[PDB]
Design a protein around this nucleic acid. Structure first.
Ligand SMILES: CN[C@@H]1[C@@H](O)[C@@H](O[C@@H]2[C@@H](O)[C@H](O[C@H]3O[C@H]([C@@H](C)O)[C@@H](O)[C@H](O)[C@H]3N)[C@@H](N)C[C@H]2N)OC[C@]1(C)O
Ligand SMILES: CN[C@@H]1[C@@H](O)[C@@H](O[C@@H]2[C@@H](O)[C@H](O[C@H]3O[C@H]([C@@H](C)O)[C@@H](O)[C@H](O)[C@H]3N)[C@@H](N)C[C@H]2N)OC[C@]1(C)O
Lengths: 131, 386, 62
RNA sequence: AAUAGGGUGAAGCCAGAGGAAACUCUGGUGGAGGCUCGUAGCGGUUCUGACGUGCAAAUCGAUCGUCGAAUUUGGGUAUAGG
RNA sequence: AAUGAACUAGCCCUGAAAAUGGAUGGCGCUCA
RNA sequence: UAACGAGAUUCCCACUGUCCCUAUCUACUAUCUAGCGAAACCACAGCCAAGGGAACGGGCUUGGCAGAAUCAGCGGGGAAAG
RNA sequence: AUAACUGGCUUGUGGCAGUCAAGCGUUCAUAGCGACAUUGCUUUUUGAUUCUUCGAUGUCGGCUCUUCCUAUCAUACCGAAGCAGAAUUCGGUAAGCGUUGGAUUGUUCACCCACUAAUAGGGAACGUGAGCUGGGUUUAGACCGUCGUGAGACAGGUUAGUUUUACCCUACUGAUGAAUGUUAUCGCAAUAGUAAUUGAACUUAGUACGAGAGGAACCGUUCAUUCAGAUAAUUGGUUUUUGCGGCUGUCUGAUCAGGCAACGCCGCGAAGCUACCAUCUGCUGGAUUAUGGCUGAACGCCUCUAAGUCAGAAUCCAUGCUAGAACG
């Protein structure tokens, strides 16, 4: 629930982002992005705060080889906020969540983008610094 | 056989042909519909595109995430010195459409508008309107009979007006002359208002107010001959394509045995006539105001012009209109500003904007100062300052 | 609106100008132009770049 | 008649060490090979690149195989249409 | 002050969906 | 089956405009000019829709229509050329 | 005179639609289905045939791009139900608007993964090779298996195998232009084109409805998808600004200042161009379809229909937008 403004997309299908929670996963490989419509040849791509469908390429065995939801919490592609600030993080990262948006782990390493925390209260609960 | 997969058409079939505009001045295709009960007023105004800048504003949209918060927005400056009314035209309804009945001109025409009637001004005897001027000198009775004609027969009245292009930094000396329709009042009132404004200046603030939503008519930037990839946005063919890849691979089926008008082709791109609507007026600044670029919150004694001047235009030293966002045309292009053709009651139409700050750093590079004084204060004394 | 300061050069940042970088350790860096951002990413020391505020103060200039 | 510059380091030889013996170990030296990286040279993989009424009835650019031998090549000479 | 059932067969309607725009030859025609 | 392979194949790391999704820049062309100056091909020629027809017409029949001279491009058609 | 494509006739076969109503459907043929039979339509399957082409119509698929059909997957509005609600199913007007990203396969086909409002089906010489590609098929090299005494065969498998030309005509896209007394400015508007699209969250509301479990919608608010037209504030990309700086080798005796490295290399780099990699903008009147109604006969009753008439869809015509007839 919420309505975030359009952001410059950072993670097309095939992107591997860092996993930032303590679930035991180390990577997150994007295979789909929630809300992607139809356009011939255009890859689905995600920005911070977007729910993706992901697999774990590197991490605990019981997390691997499975399709799960995940949410992007930061991106290194610069994007412009409505206040005119173009900003970007050091890397792309996400967290494993529930279809309802509820995290699987309980802690988050590193900063979380303000748009993601505004959109997802459970991630905001586990976040430290929010930018 | 059918397309293997579906995709929307490239480009719009409603902006055809993609040809060069017939004139550089953009014409007003349609004027706002006349309402007799309103005061007599102009419906359009001509200006010159000077450049773009950045502003800061607080948003007033309840329910928005940016409600009561600062937003940064692009905006366009239109150099709008007052126009001069020099004539009037009456139009009669016919079963074949509007037909102009007669044209009546003011007694004196300034040199800048009379230059408009010449291809070689420096070699001419400047005879334009010299015998017409004598239609006033005797007793002006012929002029008044023509105006009576317009009152008796016209249903639509438009004024002839020209820009004062010598108040702009443009090296062009020819003024731009246009018909602007008069709306409100009876036909007789329209003719009287036109008559009382012969040779007079009319300012922008009399046509357009602040927070209004207005339309811009102008010819777009020219790009010359263009290929289909950029002219229509078609997909680039693969790298290993013999004879090139910036093409449309199939330009039609075998039948019909003719290339269809709907297929993308290489041709002239840009320099098209466009009518863009719904651009909000953020400011109607005044040329005499020495703090054009200042706001209530930013009290610096500052003009709208950026440090160094607007690039490839100059300084805006007249009345101006600050418009939200971007408008068709390039720097120096004459633009026609028109009132809205409909009543808009949405929040974005009825919002009152209050500017916090207008950018005036250089547009010629990475400008990091708003004023020469701020530059001196930051950098201190320099060698050239002794 | 408040004016910000370039983390590298010291120049003033007006609304919309430059970029905002958030390092992995959550620290925020502001740059007024792509020159200072590029010099930052090249790992240059601003105290050794003559036109920066850090250099000019470190060398007692002004 | 012709064939840069490197790498590797075969037998043989010198010295030392260990061992009861049989033998073994270490450091040098030496400069083997249809060995190897890579020029000239010889060849001709891919771009299915250029060209495709060509510069050319087989070429041009890059990329590439090989490069001390079953190597490359001039001249002389022999084999002639079932 | 006429009405009820079953049925017969004329014109008309339904049954009657394809790809370029288009063919009672065309225009058009309705006590034709 | 060690070694070797411009041989065929699968996956991984690195890498990237192959792609998302395109943008920009340089040289030589193309372009315009002075000079010079070919060839392929050519029944006659050259706007469409339907019909009938050697059953997919530029010409024939019925319609739509129809205004000199042209330049850069283009690859639908000429069931184009070879 | 005769096969291997397209096209033509045919339509068995493929595909689609009707008629009847034995049964199913807790009772009830027809809400939804529907056996045994039987009437058709289509040319998106495959055959049958051999009319056209053998002094040659380039022979798979994909990629690209436009347009058409409707037998409608979604989106608009509706009628029906074994429609309480939610969901779903049957049907009508409707082709205005969309119909995707991937793993394996040369594949069409098939099959999974995933997103989505939805992932409908088809045509255009089985659209589309002087548009490409060339993985497959289908010349010559080579290998295997089975067959053959053998040369060799094989809708069996495998590997390597040159994809030519437009400068003509027309068409298309843009661009000039004679003639209309001359020249200039301002206009009108026939005709042609046309554009927007779909979703989410909040609110209504834990409301209506429901024993419960569950669980809507109209008005409204904020965003977003696909598309379209611009623009260059800003941010990013781009550099022969060869603008500034740096670096190697060598040359001008050194210094200064320069030359060359078939733009020598590196950092920055304005301007210009440009990106859902950036920002802005995308209108409102009338008439209808389906359908639901009013009055009202025919036919003393009834009936939305016969006369008349009201409302009413993403439809249509306008408004608005693009061009402006080069013989208005
Ligand atoms: C198997 N039988 C072959 C038979 O076919 C025939 O062979 C001819 C051969 O003689 C021809 O050759 C002939 O002509 C050529 C040339 C002038 O064309 C000459 O070079 C040649 O000497 C002459 N014999 C050759 N061109 C075709 C074969 N089939 O001659 C006899 C034969 C060789 O036994
Ligand atoms: C781009 N990925 C697509 C993937 O989305 C999917 O596409 C299917 C497509 O194959 C189906 O279509 C298929 O199946 C239909 C049948 C179901 O009616 C057939 O008629 C059709 O010929 C066949 N192509 C289509 N109905 C849905 C798409 N999402 O499978 C094909 C694909 C190429 O991998």
């Amino acid at each position: 629930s919420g309505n975030k403004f359009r952001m410059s997309l950072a993670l097309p299908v095939g992107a591997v982002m860092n996993c930032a929670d303590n679930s035991g996963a180390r990577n997150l490989y994007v295979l789909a992005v929630k809300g992607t419509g139809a356009r011939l040849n255009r890859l689905p791509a995600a920005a911070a705060g977007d729910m993706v469908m992901a697999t774990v390429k590197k991490g605990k065995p019981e997390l691997r080889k499975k399709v799960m939801p995940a949410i992007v919490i930061r991106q290194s592609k610069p994007w412009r906020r409505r206040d005119g600030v173009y900003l970007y993080f050091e890397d792309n990262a996400g967290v494993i969540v529930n279809p309802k948006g509820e995290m699987k782990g309980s802690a988050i390493t590193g900063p979380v983008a303000k748009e993601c925390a505004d959109l997802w209260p459970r991630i905001a609960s586990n976040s430290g610094v929010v930018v | 056989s059918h397309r293997k997969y579906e995709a929307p058409r490239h480009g719009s079939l409603g902006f055809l042909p993609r040809k060069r505009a017939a004139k550089q001045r953009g014409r007003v295709k349609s004027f706002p519909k006349d309402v007799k009960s309103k005061p007599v007023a102009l419906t359009a105004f001509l200006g010159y595109k000077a450049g773009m800048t950045t502003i800061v504003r607080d948003l007033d949209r309840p329910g928005s995430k940016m409600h009561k918060r600062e937003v940064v927005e692009a905006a366009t400056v239109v150099d709008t010195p007052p126009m001069v009314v020099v004539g009037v035209v009456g139009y009669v309804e016919t079963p074949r459409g509007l037909r102009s009945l007669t044209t009546v001109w003011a007694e004196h025409l300034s040199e800048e508008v009379r230059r408009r009637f010449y291809k070689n001004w420096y070699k001419s005897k400047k005879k334009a309107f010299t015998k017409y001027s004598g239609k006033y000198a005797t007793d002006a009775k012929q002029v008044e009979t023509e105006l009576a004609r317009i009152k008796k027969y016209a249903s639509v009245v438009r004024v002839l007006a020209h820009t004062q292009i010598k108040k702009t930094p443009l090296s062009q000396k020819k003024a731009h002359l246009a018909e602007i329709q008069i709306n409100g009042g009876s036909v007789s009132d329209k003719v009287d208002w036109a008559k009382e404004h012969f040779e007079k200046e009319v300012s922008v603030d009399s046509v357009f107010e602040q927070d209004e939503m207005i339309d811009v008519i102008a010819v777009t930037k020219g790009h010359g001959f263009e290929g289909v990839t950029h002219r229509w946005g078609t997909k680039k063919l693969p790298r290993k394509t013999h004879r090139g890849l910036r093409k449309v691979a199939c330009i039609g089926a075998w039948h019909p045995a003719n290339v269809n008008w709907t297929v993308a082709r290489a041709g002239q791109n840009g320099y098209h006539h466009r009518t863009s609507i719904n651009h909000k007026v953020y400011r109607v600044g005044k040329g005499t105001d020495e703090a054009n670029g200042a706001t209530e919150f930013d009290r610096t004694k500052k003009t709208i012009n950026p440090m160094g001047g607007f690039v490839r235009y100059g300084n805006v030293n007249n009345d101006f209109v600050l418009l939200k966002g971007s408008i068709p045309g390039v720097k120096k292009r004459v633009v026609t500003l028109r009132k809205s053709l409909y009543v808009d009651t949405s929040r974005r139409a009825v919002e009152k904007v209050n500017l916090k700050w207008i950018d005036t750093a250089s547009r010629f590079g990475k400008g990091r100062f708003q004023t020469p004084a701020e530059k001196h204060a930051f950098m201190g004394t320099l060698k050239k300052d002794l | 609106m408040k004016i910000e300061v370039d983390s590298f050069s010291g120049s003033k940042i007006y609304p919309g100008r430059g970029t905002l970088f958030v390092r992995g350790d959550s620290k925020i860096f502001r740059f007024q132009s792509s020159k200072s951002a590029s010099l930052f990413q090249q790992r240059k020391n601003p105290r050794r770049i003559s036109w920066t505020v850090l250099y000019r103060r470190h060398h007692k200039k002004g």
